[PDB]
Design a protein around this ligand. Sequence first.
Ligand SMILES: *Cc1c(COP(=O)(O)O)cnc(C)c1O
Ligand SMILES: *Cc1c(COP(=O)(O)O)cnc(C)c1O
Ligand SMILES: O=C(O)CNC(=O)c1cccc(O)c1
Ligand SMILES: O=C(O)CNC(=O)c1cccc(O)c1
Lengths: 446, 446
Amino acid sequence: LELPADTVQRIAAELKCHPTDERVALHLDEEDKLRHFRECFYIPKIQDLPPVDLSLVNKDENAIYFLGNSLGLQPKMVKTYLEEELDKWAKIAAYGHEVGKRPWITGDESIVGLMKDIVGANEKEIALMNALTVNLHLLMLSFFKPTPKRYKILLEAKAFPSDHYAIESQLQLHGLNIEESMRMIKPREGEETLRIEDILEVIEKEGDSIAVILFSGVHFYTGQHFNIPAITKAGQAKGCYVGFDLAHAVGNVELYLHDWGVDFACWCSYKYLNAGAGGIAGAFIHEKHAHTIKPALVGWFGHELSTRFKMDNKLQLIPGVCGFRISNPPILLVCSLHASLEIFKQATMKALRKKSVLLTGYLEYLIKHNYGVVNIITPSHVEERGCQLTITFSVPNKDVFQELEKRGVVCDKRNPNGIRVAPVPLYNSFHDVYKFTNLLTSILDS
Amino acid sequence: LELPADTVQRIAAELKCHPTDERVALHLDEEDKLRHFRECFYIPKIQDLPPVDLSLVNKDENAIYFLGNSLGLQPKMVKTYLEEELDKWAKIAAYGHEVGKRPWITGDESIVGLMKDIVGANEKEIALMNALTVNLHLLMLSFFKPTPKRYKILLEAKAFPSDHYAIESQLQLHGLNIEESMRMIKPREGEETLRIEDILEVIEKEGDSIAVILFSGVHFYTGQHFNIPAITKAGQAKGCYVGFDLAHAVGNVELYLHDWGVDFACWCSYKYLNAGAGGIAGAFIHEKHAHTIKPALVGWFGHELSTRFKMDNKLQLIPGVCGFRISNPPILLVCSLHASLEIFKQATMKALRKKSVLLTGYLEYLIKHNYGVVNIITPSHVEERGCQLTITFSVPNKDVFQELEKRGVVCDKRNPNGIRVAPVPLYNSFHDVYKFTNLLTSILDS
Ligand SMILES: *Cc1c(COP(=O)(O)O)cnc(C)c1O
Ligand SMILES: *Cc1c(COP(=O)(O)O)cnc(C)c1O
Ligand SMILES: O=C(O)CNC(=O)c1cccc(O)c1
Ligand SMILES: O=C(O)CNC(=O)c1cccc(O)c1
């Protein structure tokens, strides 16, 4: 299978231009079978962005939005989907709990089918509920059951703060010494990312004492995409449960949670899944646990639908992850997520991931060619990253982030002088990447 | 202070009609200073309701919606408020986290001020987050700390199923015997409601062994409004924490959680608060606990805003209930609740409660006069109930509920032959009550 760099160079040869020519980007966009999906989203205009310097930009041009890994752009249909439910609420009020396209009682279940291909799990293995870190806790209350022999939680060092705090509070709940019980894998000296061989070594050596491995699927800062099946198998070989925070993985990289035998997972919906700030989150528990791992905290929405409304206070618990669902689901959040998931249905993760490899590969190619001063922290192997590249710079005189945002590039900063950029296949183009790299080159040359 | 029955009879005398005359209802509506608020809501039309028999009703008449205690009607402004946020998301995407009327990061805090008068607490004592039963669990994980001496949870028998399951699972979490540890106050033989003297007796006699009292503020089925301050003081006198599920109280009866010294509380927003199915819920913790009662489960949104985004994994916990906030808040849910709370701001709980006393009092009066066969289960004392009356019937030949719903009355059923009705002051009229009672009379007379 042709690597992105090789595709770019071959296309350039065919076009009779240099691989760094704008025509290469324009051609890749012409050949992009997912090109039309860009029209499904509200893309901000450059002139409308708060930090933009109008004197450096062309009005009425679209922003170069590379922050879809943090706050995904809005599907145009969100309003329409919300209107369907507001209209029902206006027309029949309480009766909307039981009737319509999204009966409110089963609003979550009405759209969960659309998640099956995204995470690679069955409908009974997925719940759409609450918020990401909330779900992490609900799952950990059941999966983390420390003993004198097996009490550790294994995670990456410099994990996302919410997960870090969640794990710390879980350990504190059991009166466990944090320094001794919170095992955090640090990179080798002079590296920011983890080597799979090093992770597996820790698991092999310390696995007997580890109750739960809780890793990110994709690391938020380095952009490293961890080998989920390998970590899962290694942990399970030592008797650990293995779960993942897939905040940066879902809707980005392909996932097969069931087939890989992942024990549990959770994710948010407002990043690659484009559902809007604080949107309804997700949880997965492998069906193999449905009768053995029970919810720690129960509410009425974990009671089987068939008898729930008898209200006789005789719990009939739904097996598997839906037993962990505590409260009635927020229809308005279901609406916005639904609009997004219909788009994913049409695009397919297979096709999206294929475009992402070429799109991020093209970005990497242009960066490496022009400045090979500029360091890509994200792993170079195509299977070891998603959309996002994390880049650092060595320019004492320039704040590269500030100069980019003034010009309508929307991305994330980390210190001292670096950036997170994540071109996404649904609504970013190869031309976006071309434009970005030329703005960057111009900034670095002063 | 004039009782509702006496107001009705006096008004009838002034009008020169019988207290049961339609003119009495029309006059009370003319004198209702809150009358205009009815126009702020989408009221369903009778012809649009699923169970309606069109041959028994007049088309284009409004439904008689008496289920505002279960699913509140929609403020007309909900769509407008949602559009503000969708428009921001479309225009500036990620930048919406920090700017606008409702910066997404502080979306909850941007509207919490509007809850101050509703629950009678300070802004630092209220959090808008998650869902009701979820919040109940988050609070109980911190407030319920059983010991060999003090391990019981005290609640009413036949509590709402979700609360019942929550309490059961909390006890199971600590390995406590449910039958011994879950103390449930049952009514006297031949009664459905609880006597305050009986509740206080249990507290006095068993209080030393009770860790937490968790009562509803208003009981969902009987409509009994419990004396919150009296239960709070009695529990605290015995060293118990006292908390309330205010699902049926908030936006219905007046509340002074801080001044009463209530330890903690939680509530939903889709009942009297009209926020839409599964809307963003609420939690209260008295400020007296801010430095002593810490969250059991922590996430990044419990970390002080000023340093949260440094992402250095060094927790700086917000004192009080906001420390219990785990995840970033759902803006779309904030929108719908905000639309409702602006209406409550204009109306005031004081004025709403005053109308409710007269409105429910008038309903009771008409029921008692025509059939004094018909039993009101809800306490008769005006201070011992909210909007809702629960009514039972003794007619072997008639399903009263089915006959009411066919005629465009929207209410709730319980067996064998009874109903829950809750005329609400924001959008129900005295004429609604008059019409309802005449439909009921006609049904009962066969
Ligand atoms: C309506 C109600 C609930 C509903 O629970 P959710 O968590 O909102 O699904 C719970 N408890 C009481 C007392 C209620 O009246
Ligand atoms: C974005 C993200 C979160 C956000 O937490 P919320 O519960 O949604 O507020 C948590 N963990 C990871 C790994 C994330 O990337
Ligand atoms: O983008 C990330 O990796 C993590 N950050 C967020 O999810 C985020 C950023 C700003 C506001 C917010 O609520 C969440
Ligand atoms: O109305 C009550 O007292 C309790 N019921 C609900 O809150 C309710 C009813 C139907 C659907 C739902 O999600 C909640």
